[PDB]
Symmetry: D2
Subunit: 119 residues, 4 copies
Amino acid sequence: GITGTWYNQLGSTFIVTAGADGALTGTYESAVGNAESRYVLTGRYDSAPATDGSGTALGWTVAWKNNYRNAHSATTWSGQYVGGAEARINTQWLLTSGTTEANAKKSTLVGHDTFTKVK
Amino acid sequence: GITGTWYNQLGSTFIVTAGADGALTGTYESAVGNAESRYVLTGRYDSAPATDGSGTALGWTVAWKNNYRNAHSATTWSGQYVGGAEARINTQWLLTSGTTEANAKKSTLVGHDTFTKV
Amino acid sequence: GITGTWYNQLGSTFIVTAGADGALTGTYESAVGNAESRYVLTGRYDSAPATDGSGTALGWTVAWKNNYRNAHSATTWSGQYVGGAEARINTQWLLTSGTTEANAKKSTLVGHDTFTKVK
Amino acid sequence: GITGTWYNQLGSTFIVTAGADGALTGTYESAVGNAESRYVLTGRYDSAPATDGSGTALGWTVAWKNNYRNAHSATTWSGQYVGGAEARINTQWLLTSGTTEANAKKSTLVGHDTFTKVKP
Ligand SMILES: O=C(O)CCCC[C@@H]1SC[C@@H]2NC(=O)N[C@@H]21
Ligand SMILES: O=C(O)CCCC[C@@H]1SC[C@@H]2NC(=O)N[C@@H]21
Ligand SMILES: O=C(O)CCCC[C@@H]1SC[C@@H]2NC(=O)N[C@@H]21
Ligand SMILES: O=C(O)CCCC[C@@H]1SC[C@@H]2NC(=O)N[C@@H]21
């Protein structure tokens, strides 16, 4: 249920493949920020989730460097997949930018993204 | 550089290899929590970082399932590598557990880990 | 403005008064968790926000102890007030529980709440 | 245990009074960022913690406006006070800057501060 294309509330596109082993691989295209086109993403997910009515834990990372540009930053998403007729991946994220010591307070932004199979 | 064996303030062990094209692969062993032995990790890092003294951005994930146990959770670490005399990786992490929709509020813990090669 | 009765997506009720001095005072009643009835809250907000369309920064805290129960925990909400037709307060929160050294990992939960005066 | 002067690893100064009623009141002076001098802070803490080794839950907010300047931002610290030999207040914080809807992703920074009774 995780493999496929996902869309978040910002208009971004998350293309992922969930491996039989627990591997998450794919590309991410952000609708906002210092980003253009697709970026590599890699992550992990619980490949044997509880069959007791709970989501499937997972996470992935995107370093914002590709053949077109480098934002010198990286974002990690942490959350869970919930299946069904209204599938969704609910996440909280941390976007860290490389900084000088003097600027360490500005290194990490926090937010949340909800992904659905629609849009 | 990033490639090597690191330890955080809890005594956890982070063994990682930084690929030339931005990949991070390795193993993680936590000193605390619902975990035992090593777990697979994968991530990404800026392989062409700025040269103005700024750290190198990076991140990685561990899903807490291995051959011995499964905690039905996953942690992501977001941070940066800083070289020099006392090289370190400063991170903030999010640990999400699979939950019911009703328990979503208890789903994600937040913290911070600092790693050094010592 | 900020003064008023707000509700978030969980059904919790946030009753607040924004003082001319930048203070936030009021009560909070959570629809979920280890809580019952009203709890005291206090916080601060920018009483001279920018005039370029930016939101008004604010934050408040609730320690989860009142005359009826004590959860040995406290939550802080950080966010901004957005005026206009549909006024809203968008927040990210941290819920810290008192813990022993051994349970440090479980000390702080992070989430997000959106409030409106509707309900 | 809580009332008094605290310093974080950045050298910021947190002077607070914990009321018998759960109130936290005081001043905060940041060593970094768009700030100068002292700012008003208000917060709350558990006035009857578990006497079992557990810390004392608490939190406070500073809106970064005072008589000298206004950064149009506010920080909330969430954490717990731990007494004993080496007393500390361990916290995680969220700093939200007022932004337009278009700059939402850049609205909230996250970090951590460890406060001690002895300057860094
Ligand atoms: O600006 C940058 O440093 C690189 C792009 C960051 C895009 C962020 S990642 C968190 C959020 N979710 C998205 O889909 N886009 C933004
Ligand atoms: O309890 C669990 O669900 C799985 C183990 C979590 C270990 C956490 S990950 C964040 C922190 N850093 C560590 O090295 N260990 C803990
Ligand atoms: O369980 C507890 O420790 C005390 C109650 C916490 C209720 C949380 S605070 C963050 C979120 N928003 C709400 O309105 N309720 C929950
Ligand atoms: O730059 C600003 O918007 C206002 C000042 C922010 C100072 C931050 S609050 C979190 C961290 N802890 C400190 O003591 N100082 C910085």
